[PDB]
């Protein structure tokens, strides 16, 4: 349930992972008429804010019927090229901590620390320990 923070710890030099082929998900469908789409892998911090409207992702969660499969795929592809994160690569190895970044994107840069991010996104990088 809680603290599913599992120290995924992606590496900064591989954040171009973004263009992954429709990052793995989990579909389900029951009589509650929900359209639940869980997100597998390092993507459980992304929250479709009041942006992304009119993207396919929104307009499908009104399809009352059972959800076709290919729709999920091509809509995810259409969505992934809109989503983005802040990062900067430099000499050496560094991990990204993947948390403040996702957050300061999760909320579109409105809380004070986001100013510390959007103005200068190296502080997100960090060596062996203590990303804070």
């Amino acid at each position: 349930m809680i603290d599913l923070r599992l120290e995924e710890d992606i590496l900064t030099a591989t954040l171009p992972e973004f263009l992954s082929t429709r990052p793995k998900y989990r579909y389900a469908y029951t009589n509650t008429k929900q359209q639940d789409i869980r997100f597998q892998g390092p993507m459980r911090h992304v929250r479709l804010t009041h942006l992304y409207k009119q993207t396919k992702l929104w307009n499908l969660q009104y399809i009352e019927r059972e959800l076709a499969i290919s729709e999920i795929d091509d809509a995810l592809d259409e969505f992934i090229q809109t989503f983005s994160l802040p990062y900067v690569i430099e000499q050496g190895t560094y991990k990204y901590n993947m948390l403040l970044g996702m957050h300061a994107h999760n909320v579109n840069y409105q809380d004070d620390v986001s100013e510390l991010i959007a103005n200068n996104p190296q502080l997100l990088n960090y060596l062996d320990d203590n990303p804070f």
Binding site: L51, S84, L85, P86, H105, N108, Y109, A118, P121
Partner: peptide, 9 residues
Amino acid sequence: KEYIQVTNQ
């Protein structure tokens, strides 16, 4: 040549 994209939406 590379691009410097925008972080904020």
